[PDB]
Design a protein around this ligand. Structure first.
Ligand SMILES: O=P(O)(O)O[C@H]1[C@H](OP(=O)(O)O)[C@@H](OP(=O)(O)O)[C@H](OP(=O)(O)OP(=O)(O)O)[C@H](OP(=O)(O)OP(=O)(O)O)[C@@H]1OP(=O)(O)O
Ligand SMILES: O=P(O)(O)O[C@H]1[C@H](OP(=O)(O)O)[C@@H](OP(=O)(O)O)[C@H](OP(=O)(O)O)[C@@H](OP(=O)(O)O)[C@H]1OP(=O)(O)O
Lengths: 997, 210, 207, 214, 234
């Protein structure tokens, strides 16, 4: 099908025998083509006799006597569309002499048989639909007289209005008529008094397939008479049929199909086709709306299936004639976002006037439903299939103009599948075929029919979404799932609706509510959990929305009708919390547009080439805009610090479940900001929750207090080095004017200052920067040893906990647990906890950690050796800006401490120590840690105990020397001089280290 | 192909060292840590096969417990038909032929073979087996075997000094300071299989530290 | 992960603590053996699986527990019943095993689905196991544990792993296995005794 | 577990069946439509007895049900030959769901496309179970399978109250099939079976028409 | 690989069972059965595709027992195989239970054999369907039908083969207006059914008719001149 449709959109299928006479235009190769065109009719007729056996051997077998397979499968739906494509392209690219001899092959097949209307019903009638879309005159002369003369024979003869199962030939000839009447709607005005006659007789049947084939008849008649669409898709604009023998057809086989002078033919609805489009709407919508009106008022009391049958008529008249129907009116205001500039909705003339004076049928349906839906949800809450149709109508009362939002996306992909397949990339846009280009112009019309960018949130839209919100929270999960998808699609369309509906949807989540069902409750949490790609309604990007949704999740739980024993609701909160942490992104507090936006004044003024807007004024409204921005900057700061207080009042809430505070700490870990400092009650919280019994909370408190200490960092001062002034004299490595960066002899022992410590490794290797910047001298950095007197008296209550020995001894105890025995590594986030402690406080806590450092090193357990190693390396990389007293006082207890630890190194510990002192050598000068490099290079292979210890003692030496990569030539020699006798007499586990060293 | 997947658990399982002496044969394995709340009784890797034969292992502890309780039947189904106890080569050839896919363990089958001769074997997971003076199986087996190649000749003067300055000194090459991380086994000629309690296991390490 | 059964060993008994999980409201609250399946006169078990594959694994353990008793006229030791199923699973659900025998006293085991077991002083299997394995490692006196002190630890670590606002007093299934007057007693504790441990926890932890 | 998930698609395409456990009885109501008037409505039966006191209905594939109704009758008589007592309803479902599991386990054999609803009566207490094609089985107060069973179980949860008698459960079972019937149910279009102290029996169609007058 | 054996589709369908119903339509023939108030008639097409056929050996009506008749529609080699099980299972009932098998229990026996083809992947379904007619001792005439799926329902009138759906609509329409039949003028209902949908009705030696009655329960295939009497009066 892909093969013949890609050939029969290039070559016209026309006989060439009247050109096979005396004519000097034919070359040697071209006369060989024209004689071979005698088999073009023999191709098309043998394509049909091969496709008829492809259909009649693919009819649906009803094997199981209980069920009815009604779905055409995905593999069979492709063969419908694969034969709807590959036959409509043959039969368009085809002469009228070969058409009409092939039209009869379709008619003498599809009317002498009776097909099952499920698989072979959609598949024969699509093959007839191709026969009608190519010549609607000659094809409709014989189908619609045949089908209408046999529906009226087989329906209205007896009393087959009320029935259980229709006759399978009556039920055939509706689908043979319904899927065939969507030709160009001008040439359906010949059959007005035949199509209306059967619609007045088979649309109000009782069989559930009988009226849906009649609703599809009413649908496609309205689709054909109000849409703009191309009627022909041929490769030549005149067609292969209307000038026979006026031009030679075998020249236009490789037609590049020019975009200028395309010759495209359109179907704009005339007033004859539009007044008929309202005459079907004035004879079948309004009689089906007055029966729904008096049923929702209490004065008709229809059956459960009688309402269901009537809504399909309302749905197939709305979805199907929506191009004629204006959207709404009413303009809801006074609660949305106010603006200084225009927020007018965009308007795109998709060509039709729709005079908007007579009826406005879309507003009448919106008033019938709000009475009908108010009756059904109170008087019969069990009628599911009526509620599915009301979701389908409100889904089209709001956002349905002439095209569909998903059918456009599937024709956009089907165009790029066809365009990118057969495209001359050698010479540009000038070789795309005409059948592609006509569809892309139609894809431009269909883009304009769906490009509703701005849409004002009106008062009817305030009511129709809230009626979807009742159906998003109703009794039945089948009804809730379909209603939420319409709810979420209607939240993306209209401007500031999500601020209106968060206060309405969180009313099903408050503890104080008296009667709220479990279907009422979790249906509102599928409204928060957006479960799609369009709108996450609990994780919006505004403070006025996040200050309501995040507390209401934590306020639920502690009291609600929250069945936490049902397993689906537990997966719902675990998805609602795991969508927030995945999707959250930090919100600004200062929208201060800088003074370098004279460009905006140069764009408002003096553009003038299209700019028909003669105002050009802002005398003191720029002061009002600054004032309202500073109020926005104040409220964004205010709603941030109210969000912290409302979560802490919800996590420190009595009688919470445990599963609702892990979400509550989980929403506080996202609020820890860089431009601000976290509020005081949260600094008290995360420090006190370091010692929490739940391992999940205190794993988050480690990740939060490490960020608090980054906020409380005290901003060291810097200065600039000219590297010519030091090193005595003014090219990619190891220069003459680079010798001071290489640690060999002159290491600082007493006069530790005035040494020009370059911290990070890579500086000065290749070249020098314009401004080589190091830290200051002695005591120009901020003061280290201080007490609570000279301190920020609100943000270093963290000082009060690490001085308390009960807090520390419980913190050391929890960190030496085992979260798992296998997956247990050197945590780089407990490291950044202790790096931010000893950097910020400058070993004010190290005398309170005297036993808890010396106890953990003298332990065989790998849990405590891992616990102490994050503290050891955090001491070392916290000792960057320490005075020379505190550095020597650090290593006076630390150099015996590692020699103890490197002695008792184990199998489950050498990756911890191999990432402990290899972490502590990260961005430090090799001057400032020579106590390591005199200890680690002391005796790595002089094995006091065992041989695997000597290999693990050498692997930790490897990562420390590698991390100070080129900054040390000397210790690489001292270790090479060490190994060059020793490398002959070692064992294999040491050889695998010496080779790795 | 399928036997190569067996060996990857031998290289990660705990070490197993055996030497062979003039009068006694000694196994010794690395007792790993279990958990904080795991009773460490059911995780011992020195199993007795009959009264004159025992073996260590390294690999899957599931497939070992199949190998042990199949070799414990062939140690007893031998005595029904032969009335003599197994030679150490008989049960080693039984375990190797027992190893679809081979059972992913490597063992150190030791003991005596009814004439008082000391024996030490190894069933690699390929199905192969051969004799040994001293051997090592497990995670650091290549370096321990290189250590035992250095020390074999004049150690068998005293059966105590043979079997600590080799066996515990070979575990101490790879395993920790000891005492609670060494499970050590020793059997004399036709006496019993005795696993040394850690009150006596720490006794021998103190002589080694001196 | 479906069940939430957890074992705790003490000096004078072992205890299983499973939670009764009821998904839909129209499921019948069965009055039969719900969560703690008694294997023979001195041993019980609990599975981390659906109650259909429970009836296959427990009625296979009961064949092993009675082919032993038919053969030796003694009750089966509480490791050989664990081992014989772990040999069958070696040729797909995790279990716990509480029991008593004359050899190694009160015992607790945990069969992996691969076929591996181990003696535990306290452990968890099923839903949020590592959340409660870690909580037992915080507070368990490994040797200084009385039965009621172990029993208060169970409803402590169950109040931080299952449900909302009541610890599901009618949906938690503590069974204790003790020695009394020579025989062996297995007491699935009643709803009045299971409710008071929630009351003795909510009073002691609030005060 | 791929074919087992696909056999449940064959169950959920099947005809609706509703079971409700009352105080003193169990009701099994189902859909027995015929495609034509040519089908004899009373020739084959969907509600089907196992013992004097156990009956079971299905949703799913017709012929796969008869394999399970032939094994459940053997397993009920292999109990009765040994123990000389009518089989407990709990013990019957354990043996039927072991048979349904036995075809998922062995290869080259597809699972059954059948869920079962198994009523019963033992020791003065009613029983209603449901065996899945996976071999799983669950005790229910009231449930439904077939087409629109998600809508059925939500309909049952609003109209269940454990103090209802057996005559009140026949109404709320036909009212559950009424919601997803799509037609006009006569005495022939449905099949009801009740199980009480007197035993299991499927209702004769003249007895059902009295319940259809409500 | 779920289209080459009898396992489920992701939609829950057995494709080989559905393809086996298409194997019934490959025979090019059509059988029609109908039940009377005291009679049961089956009517087939008897196509003689070669002039060298002994036409006595081309048939689709078969005696199963002395008073249970059959008609097979579909693959001819599969049809003779499924007769042979019905020949066996109806004589095995008489030996094990001492009375003639019902048409109830013979279809349920044959359909339970046919279910095993739809569950084991090592064998295909038989591409043919059986329509058994017979007189019960207490229920009167019975017309039942097995299919390749395994369904064994009971019928007032049924059809099989290429014109199965078209013959059903002819039999539904006559079974709604009246009691669908009376006595052995029920033969005239079935012969019109096979002649309306196939649109030939050429000769009275191109069909095959078999009957069971209350007054004569044995299955007797009508002769050519015996079946010309119903066709000259048609
Ligand atoms: O509107 P779509 O579907 O998104 O696709 C647009 C592309 O996206 P954009 O408009 O920027 O959003 C754009 O391509 P890039 O900018 O990414 O390179 C255009 O390229 P351009 O014309 O500038 O480049 P040149 O002409 O190829 O040199 C068009 O590509 P061609 O067909 O090769 O170009 P032709 O339209 O044939 O002239 C294409 O027009 P179609 O609609 O026909 O696919
Ligand atoms: O010593 P390190 O572990 O390598 O960390 C340093 C340190 O950051 P911390 O405050 O987190 O310890 C520097 O901070 P100061 O000493 O200058 O106060 C910071 O410098 P900046 O604050 O100016 O960014 C620098 O970052 P950088 O390398 O970009 O200069 C960063 O190094 P890392 O980014 O590698 O961690």
């Amino acid at each position: 099908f892909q093969f013949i449709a890609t050939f029969s959109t290039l070559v016209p299928l026309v006989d060439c025998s009247s050109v096979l006479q005396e004519r000097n235009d034919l070359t040697e190769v071209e006369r060989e083509l024209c004689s071979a065109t005698a088999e073009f009719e023999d191709f098309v007729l043998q394509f049909m006799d091969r496709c008829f056996g492809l259909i009649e051997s693919s009819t649906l077998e009803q094997t199981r006597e209980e069920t009815e397979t009604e779905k055409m499968t995905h593999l069979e739906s492709l063969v419908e569309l694969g034969l709807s494509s590959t036959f409509s392209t043959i039969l368009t690219q085809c002469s009228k002499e070969i058409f009409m001899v092939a039209l009869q092959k379709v008619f003498n097949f599809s009317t002498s048989h009776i097909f099952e209307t499920r698989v072979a019903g959609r598949m024969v009638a699509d093959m007839c639909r191709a026969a009608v879309k190519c010549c609607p005159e000659e094809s409709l002369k014989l189908f619609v007289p045949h089908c209408c003369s046999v529906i009226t024979q087989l329906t209205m003869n007896d009393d087959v209005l009320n029935d259980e199962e229709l006759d399978k030939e009556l039920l055939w000839n509706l689908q043979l008529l319904s899927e065939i009447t969507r030709v160009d709607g001008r040439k359906l005005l010949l059959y007005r008094e035949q199509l209306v006659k059967i619609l007045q007789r088979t649309l109000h049947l009782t069989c559930k397939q009988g009226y849906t084939l009649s609703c599809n008849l009413l649908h496609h008649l309205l689709r054909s008479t109000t849409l703009i669409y191309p009627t022909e898709y041929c490769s030549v604009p005149g067609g292969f049929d209307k000038p026979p023998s006026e031009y030679f057809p075998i020249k236009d086989w490789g037609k590049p199909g020019d975009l200028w002078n395309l010759g495209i033919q359109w179907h704009v609805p005339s007033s004859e086709e539009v007044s008929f489009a309202f005459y079907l709407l004035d004879s079948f919508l309004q009689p089906e709306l007055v029966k729904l009106q008096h049923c929702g008022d209490g004065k008709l009391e229809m059956s459960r299936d009688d309402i269901l049958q009537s809504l399909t008529i309302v749905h197939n008249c709305l979805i199907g004639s929506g191009n004629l129907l204006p959207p709404l009116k009413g303009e809801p205001v006074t609660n949305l976002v106010p603006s200084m500039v225009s927020l007018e909705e965009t308007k795109l003339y998709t060509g039709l006037e729709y005079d908007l004076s007579r009826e406005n049928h879309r507003e009448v349906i919106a008033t019938v439903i709000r009475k009908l839906l108010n009756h059904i949800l109170d008087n019969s809450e069990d009628d599911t299939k009526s509620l599915f149709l009301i979701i389908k109508i409100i889904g089209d009362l709001l956002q349905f103009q002439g095209s569909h939002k998903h059918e456009f996306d599937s024709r956009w992909k089907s165009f790029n599948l066809v365009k990118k397949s057969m495209e001359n990339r050698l010479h540009g846009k000038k070789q795309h075929i005409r059948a592609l280009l006509i569809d892309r112009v139609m894809l431009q019309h269909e883009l304009r029919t769906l490009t509703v960018e701005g849409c004002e949130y009106k008062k009817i839209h305030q009511d129709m979404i809230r009626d979807l919100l009742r159906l998003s929270t109703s009794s039945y999960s089948q009804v809730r799932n379909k209603a939420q998808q319409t709810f979420f699609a209607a939240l993306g369309a209209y401007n500031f609706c999500c601020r209106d509906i968060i206060p309405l949807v969180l009313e099903f989540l408050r503890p104080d509510r008296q009667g709220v069902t479990q279907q009422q409750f979790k249906g509102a949490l599928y409204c928060l959990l957006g479960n799609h790609s369009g709108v996450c309604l609990a994780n919006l990007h505004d403070w006025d929305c996040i200050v309501q949704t995040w507390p209401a999740i934590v306020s639920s739980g502690l009291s609600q009708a929250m069945s936490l024993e049902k397993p689906s609701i537990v997966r719902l909160f675990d998805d609602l919390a795991e969508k927030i942490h995945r999707q959250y992104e930090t919100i600004g507090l200062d929208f201060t547009i800088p003074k370098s936006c004279v460009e905006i004044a140069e764009l408002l003024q003096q553009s003038k080439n299209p700019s028909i807007n003669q105002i050009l004024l802002s005398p003191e409204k720029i002061k009002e805009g600054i004032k309202r921005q500073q109020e926005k900057n104040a409220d964004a700061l205010r709603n941030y610090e109210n969000l912290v207080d409302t979560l802490l009042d919800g996590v420190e809430q009595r009688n919470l479940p445990w599963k609702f505070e892990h979400i509550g700490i989980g929403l506080l870990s996202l609020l820890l900001r860089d431009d601000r400092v976290l509020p005081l009650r949260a600094i008290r919280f995360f420090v006190e929750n370091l010692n929490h019994d739940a391992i999940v909370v205190r794993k988050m408190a480690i990740s939060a207090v490490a960020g608090i200490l980054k906020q409380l960092k005290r901003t060291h001062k810097k200065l600039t080095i000219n590297p010519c002034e030091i090193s005595g004299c003014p090219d990619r490595p190891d220069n003459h004017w680079l010798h001071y960066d290489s640690k060999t002899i002159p290491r600082t022992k007493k006069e530790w200052e005035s040494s020009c410590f370059v911290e990070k490794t890579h500086w000065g290797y290749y070249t020098w920067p314009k401004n080589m910047v190091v830290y200051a001298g002695v005591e120009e950095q901020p003061k280290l040893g201080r007490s609570r007197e000279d301190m920020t008296e609100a943000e270093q209550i963290i000082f009060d906990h690490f001085s308390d020995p009960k807090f520390v001894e419980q913190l050391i105890t929890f960190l030496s647990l085992e979260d798992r025995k296998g997956k247990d590594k050197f945590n780089p986030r407990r490291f950044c906890l202790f790096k931010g402690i000893f950097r910020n406080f400058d070993d004010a806590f190290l005398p309170v950690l005297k036993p808890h450092l010396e106890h953990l090193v003298a332990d065989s357990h790998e849990s405590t050796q891992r616990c102490v190693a994050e503290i050891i390396a955090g001491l070392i990389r916290g000792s960057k800006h320490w005075t020379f007293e505190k550095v020597e006082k650090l290593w006076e207890l630390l150099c015996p401490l590692l020699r103890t630890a490197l002695s008792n190194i184990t199998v489950e510990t050498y990756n911890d120590w191999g990432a402990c002192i290899a972490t502590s050598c990260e961005s430090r000068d090799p001057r400032k840690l020579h106590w390591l490099f005199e200890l680690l290079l002391e005796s790595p292979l002089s094995g006091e105990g065992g041989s695997f210890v000597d290999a693990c003692r050498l692997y930790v030496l490897q990562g420390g020397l590698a991390q100070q990569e080129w900054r040390v030539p000397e210790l690489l020699h001292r270790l090479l001089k060490y190994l060059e006798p020793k490398l002959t007499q070692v064992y294999k586990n040491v050889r695998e280290r010496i080779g790795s060293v | 192909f399928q036997v190569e997947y067996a060996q990857e658990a031998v290289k990660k399982g705990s070490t197993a060292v055996g030497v062979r002496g003039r009068d006694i044969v000694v196994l010794g394995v690395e007792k790993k840590s279990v958990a904080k709340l795991q009773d460490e009784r059911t995780v011992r890797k020195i199993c007795a096969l009959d009264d004159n034969v025992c073996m260590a292992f390294a690999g899957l502890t599931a497939d070992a417990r199949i190998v042990i309780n199949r070799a414990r039947v062939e140690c007893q189904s031998h005595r029904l038909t032969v009335e003599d106890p197994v030679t150490v080569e008989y049960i080693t050839r039984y375990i190797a032929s027992l190893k679809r896919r081979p059972f992913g363990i490597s063992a150190l089958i030791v003991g005596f073979d009814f004439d008082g001769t000391p024996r030490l074997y190894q069933t690699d997971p390929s199905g192969t087996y051969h004799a040994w003076k001293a051997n090592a199986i497990g995670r650091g087996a290549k370096s321990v075997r290189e250590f035992l190649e250095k020390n074999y000749t004049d150690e068998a003067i005293e059966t105590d000094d043979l079997t600590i300055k080799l066996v515990i000194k070979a575990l101490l090459e790879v395993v920790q300071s000891g005492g609670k991380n060494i499970e050590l086994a020793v059997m004399r000629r036709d006496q019993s299989l005795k696993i040394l309690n850690p009150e006596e296991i720490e006794k021998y390490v103190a002589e080694i530290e001196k | 992960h479906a069940g939430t059964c957890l074992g705790i060993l003490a000096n004078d008994g072992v205890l299983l603590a499973a939670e009764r999980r009821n998904i839909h409201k129209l499921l019948d609250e069965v009055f039969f053996s719900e969560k703690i399946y008694k294997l023979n006169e001195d041993m019980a078990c609990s599975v981390a699986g659906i109650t259909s594959d429970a009836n296959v694994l427990t009625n296979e353990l009961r064949l092993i527990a009675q082919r032993y008793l038919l053969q030796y006229q003694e009750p089966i030791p509480c490791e050989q019943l664990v081992t014989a199923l772990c040999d069958i699973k070696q040729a797909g659900v995790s279990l716990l095993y509480i029991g008593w025998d004359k050899h190694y006293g009160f015992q607790l085991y945990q069969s992996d689905p691969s076929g591996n077991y181990g003696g535990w002083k306290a452990t968890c299997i099923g839903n949020n196991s590592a959340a409660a394995v870690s909580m037992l490692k915080q507070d368990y006196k490994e040797g200084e544990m009385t039965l009621k002190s172990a029993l208060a630890l169970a409803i402590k670590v169950l109040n931080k792993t299952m449900d909302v606002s009541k610890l599901s007093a009618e949906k938690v299934e503590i069974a204790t296995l003790t020695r009394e007057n020579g025989k062996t007693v297995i007491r699935v504790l009643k709803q009045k005794e299971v409710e008071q441990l929630i009351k003795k926890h909510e009073e002691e932890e609030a005060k | 577990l791929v074919q087992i998930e696909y056999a449940l698609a064959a169950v959920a395409g099947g005809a609706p069946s509703v079971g409700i456990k009352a105080a003193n009885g169990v009701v099994l109501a189902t859909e027995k439509k015929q495609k034509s008037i040519l089908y004899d409505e009373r020739s084959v039966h969907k509600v089907e007895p196992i013992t004097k006191h156990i009956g079971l209905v299905y949703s799913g594939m017709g012929p796969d049900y008869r394999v399970l109704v032939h094994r459940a009758r053997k397993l009920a008589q292999q109990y009765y030959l040994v123990y000389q007592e009518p089989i407990p309803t709990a013990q019957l479902v354990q043996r039927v769901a072991s048979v349904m599991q036995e075809y998922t386990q062995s290869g080259g054999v597809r699972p059954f496309g059948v869920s079962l609803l198994i009523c019963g009566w033992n020791e003065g207490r009613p029983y209603l179970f449901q065996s899945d094609p996976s071999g799983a089985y669950f005790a229910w107060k009231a449930t439904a399978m077939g087409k629109n069973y998600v809508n059925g179980k939500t309909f049952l949860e609003k109209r269940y109250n454990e103090d209802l008698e057996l005559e009140d459960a026949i109404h709320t079972a036909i009212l559950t099939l009424k919601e997803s019937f799509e037609g006009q149910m006569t005495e022939d279009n449905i099949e009801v079976g009740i199980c009480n102290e007197a035993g299991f029996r499927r209702l004769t169609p003249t007895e059902v028409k009295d319940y259809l007058a409500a | 690989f779920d289209r080459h054996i009898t396992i489920f589709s992701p939609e829950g369908r057995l494709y080989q069972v559905e393809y086996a119903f298409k194997a019934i339509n490959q025979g090019g023939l059509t059988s029609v059965a109908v039940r009377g108030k005291d009679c049961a008639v089956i009517v087939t097409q008897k196509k003689v595709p070669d002039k060298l056929l002994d036409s006595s050996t081309v048939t689709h009506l078969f005696k199963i027992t002395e008073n249970i008749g059959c008609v097979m529609t579909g693959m001819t080699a599969d049809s003779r195989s499924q007769v042979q099980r019905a020949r066996y299972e109806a004589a095995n009932w008489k030996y094990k239970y001492g009375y003639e098998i019902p048409v109830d229990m013979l279809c349920k026996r044959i359909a339970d054999i046919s279910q095993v083809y739809t569950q084991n992947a090592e064998m295909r379904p038989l591409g043919c369907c059986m329509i058994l007619i017979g007189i019960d001792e207490e229920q009167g005439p019975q017309v039942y039908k097995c299919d390749p799926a395994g369904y064994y329902c009971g019928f007032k009138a049924t059809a099989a083969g290429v014109k199965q759906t078209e013959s059903t609509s002819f039999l539904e329409k006559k079974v709604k207006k009246k009691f669908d039949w009376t006595f052995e003028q029920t033969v005239e209902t079935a012969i019109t059914c096979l002649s309306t949908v196939l649109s030939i009705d050429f000769k009275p030696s191109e069909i095959e008719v078999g009957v069971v009655t209350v007054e004569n329960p044995k299955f007797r295939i009508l002769t050519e001149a015996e079946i010309d009497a119903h066709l000259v009066a048609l």
